[PDB]
Design a protein around this ligand. Structure first.
Ligand SMILES: [Mn+2]
Length: 119
């Protein structure tokens, strides 16, 4: 039973992604901000997190940090705006697997997670 947590403030996109990986066979979870995200990491200890780095009021790099502390075994793929070098460098230093810019290529994300989190 492999777990993926999808963190994104936009319901449309979040639900979209959740279904993509649910159809793939993964056990999925959803969060709209960092606090819920942190909550689920704690109670569910998901294997992989798709982290939207642009959520109002949320410091992306910080939630990454916290997630790593709560569970240093969790791997993360960050989702950015079509940009940011410092953010990427910081997430790389923290162990982030890779990053994808929005709007994203569904097939690309899909292939990426099956590669980093085979079923
Ligand atoms: Mn967002």
């Amino acid at each position: 039973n492999e777990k993926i947590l999808i963190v994104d403030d936009q319901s449309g996109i979040r639900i979209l992604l959740n279904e993509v990986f649910n159809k793939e066979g993964y056990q999925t979870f959803q969060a709209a901000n960092g606090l819920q995200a942190l909550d689920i990491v704690t109670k569910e200890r998901p294997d992989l997190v798709l982290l939207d780095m642009k959520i109002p009021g949320m410091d992306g790099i910080e939630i990454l940090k916290r997630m790593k502390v709560i569970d240093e075994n969790i791997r993360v793929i960050i989702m950015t705006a079509y940009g940011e070098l410092d953010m990427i460098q910081e997430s790389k230093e923290l162990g982030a697997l890779t990053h994808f810019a929005k709007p994203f290529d569904i097939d690309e994300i899909r292939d990426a997670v099956k590669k980093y989190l085979p079923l």
